Structures are given as C-alpha cells and as structure tokens.
Amino acid sequence: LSKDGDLIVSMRILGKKRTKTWHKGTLIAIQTVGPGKKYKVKFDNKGKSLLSGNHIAYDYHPPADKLYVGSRVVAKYKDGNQVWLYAGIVAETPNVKNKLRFLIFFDDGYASYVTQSELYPICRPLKKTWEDIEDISCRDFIEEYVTAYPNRPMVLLKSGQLIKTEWEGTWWKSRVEEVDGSLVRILFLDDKRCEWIYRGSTRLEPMFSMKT
Ligand SMILES: C=CCn1c(N[C@@H]2C[C@H](c3ccc(OCc4ccccc4)cc3)CN(C)C2)nc2cc[nH]c2c1=O
C-alpha cells in the first residue's frame, strides 16, 4: 500500500518507541499485514520501527470540539526542564472550573492539565479506546471512569488539610499544598516529595474510605 485514508507515505508523523515516549519521524511505508496494517516510521534520530495504527499520531493538534472524554491522545509532560511526549486519555474537556484546560490521564498513572496546543491525536485508536493500555490497573480505572462519566466521586480538600496518602503500599503522613481543578498537590511529610494526584484517586485516604 501507499495510502490508508489520510495516511500517506512521506508525511510527518509521531511514533511510539520501546521506551513508551513518542518522537517525530516520517512515515516511510504502509504494509497490509494480518487483518490490519502496520506503519513503518523512520525517526529523526535515524532509527526505525514498524508500528500498529494505534502507536502513531498525527503531527498536528486536534481541533478541540473533536476531542472528548475517552479520546486517545499524546501529550507533553515537562520533566523538570526536559519535555517528553506520552500517550494518554482525555479525562476533562475545557471549562470554567479547570481554567479551560484538558485533563489528561497518562497511560502510566499520572494526570495533568494541558492545552489544545500540547495535544496530538492518535491515528487509529481502538473503538474502546482504553483497550490498548498495557497497565491493567489503568485499563480498568479508565474503563470505569469513561463508562460512569459524568459520575466522578472526588474528595474535597482545602489547602492546608492533612491526610494520609498511599505510596508503595504504605500510608504516609502528608499535607495538601495546593488544589487545581480535579487535582491536588500532596506533600509527603517524611521524605518531602510533592506529587499531583487526581482528587478521585484512592491513594488519598478519604477517597479510599468513601470507596469501601
Ligand atoms: C512529577 C512527575 C513524576 N511522576 C511521574 N512521571 C512519569 C514519567 C513518565 C516517563 C517520562 C519519560 C520517560 O522517558 C525517559 C527515558 C526512559 C527510558 C529510556 C530513555 C529515556 C519515561 C517515563 C511519564 N509519565 C507521564 C509521568 N509519573 C507518576 C505516576 C505517579 N506519580 C508520578 C510522578 O510523580
């Protein structure tokens, strides 16, 4: 093949690497294989990979208003001063309470708000968009969140409040530092990490009680 719909050899594309981060590259081949197609990408760092349609993204931000809770996307994370692209799911479309940003649940647990300009859309997502999440606890969470929506039990926390927050199987004295839309910044008080957590997460002691 040389076309699959709007996918046409030589164009620019994002591809997913074995490290789970995505990188710009050029689509250099399209080959029917099996019931589907596979998509050969030559990355800018000279490398190459043969990716299924759900592991390439288009080099252009989605028209908001085509995006929705469930939408499969790729988004920027800001590792200190590094910047990585990581695949995720849209948990909130923009509105007043979240200061008109998108809440992205990443494939790997984490959550953060972003903007139309920090989002790339995945080319051929599964129908049930979460079925390609490799981590199971996240595949099930996202399934239940998207299906239930607009039901979203969260706890309300105020800046200053003290709570227990789970971390590697143990519950840590911690403190709430800041709240932003559907996320809170917890400070674990023994070892001094901060962490953003979705306020409906069960790592939060209140939410863990509410939910048993
Ligand atoms: C404050 C944020 C830290 N953080 C994070 N970060 C992760 C970082 C993840 C990542 C990013 C870049 C990577 O590639 C580097 C590289 C790897 C191998 C070879 C070569 C290069 C690899 C992994 C991406 N997801 C989005 C967030 N996840 C969670 C979850 C609960 N809590 C937190 C938290 O606190």
From Swiss-Prot:
Chain ranges of the Tudor domain: 66-129, 156-212
Compartments, as annotated in UniProt: Nucleus; Cytoplasm; Chromosome
Encoding gene (name): SETDB1
Protein name as catalogued: Histone-lysine N-methyltransferase SETDB1
Domain observations: The pre-SET, SET and post-SET domains are all required for methyltransferase activity. The 347-amino-acid insertion in the SET domain has no effect on the catalytic activity. Isoform 2 lacks all domains required for histone methyltransferase activity.
Record's comment on post-translational modification: Degraded by the proteasome, shielded by interaction with ATF7IP. The conjugated-Ub is protected from deubiquitination by the SET domain.
Chain's role: Histone methyltransferase that specifically trimethylates 'Lys-9' of histone H3. H3 'Lys-9' trimethylation represents a specific tag for epigenetic transcriptional repression by recruiting HP1 (CBX1, CBX3 and/or CBX5) proteins to methylated histones. Mainly functions in euchromatin regions, thereby playing a central role in the silencing of euchromatic genes. H3 'Lys-9' trimethylation is coordinated with DNA methylation. Required for HUSH-mediated heterochromatin formation and gene silencing.
Tissue/organ expression: Widely expressed. High expression in testis.
Subunit structure: Part of a complex containing at least CDYL, REST, WIZ, SETDB1, EHMT1 and EHMT2. Forms a complex with ATRX, TRIM28 and ZNF274. Probably part of a corepressor complex containing ZNF304, TRIM28, SETDB1 and DNMT1. Interacts with TRIM28/TIF1B. Interacts with ATF7IP and ATF7IP2; the interaction with ATF7IP protects SETDB1 from proteasomal degradation and is required to stimulate histone methyltransferase activity and facilitate the conversion of dimethylated to trimethylated H3 'Lys-9'. Interacts with CBX1 and CBX5. Interacts with DNMT3A and DNMT3B. Interacts with SUMO2. Interacts with MPHOSPH8.
Entry similarity comment: Belongs to the class V-like SAM-binding methyltransferase superfamily. Histone-lysine methyltransferase family. Suvar3-9 subfamily.
Additional record remark: Highly up-regulated in Huntington disease patients, suggesting that participates in the altered chromatin modulation and transcription dysfunction observed in Huntington disease. Its down-regulation has salubrious effects on patients, suggesting that it may be a promising treatment in Huntington disease patients.
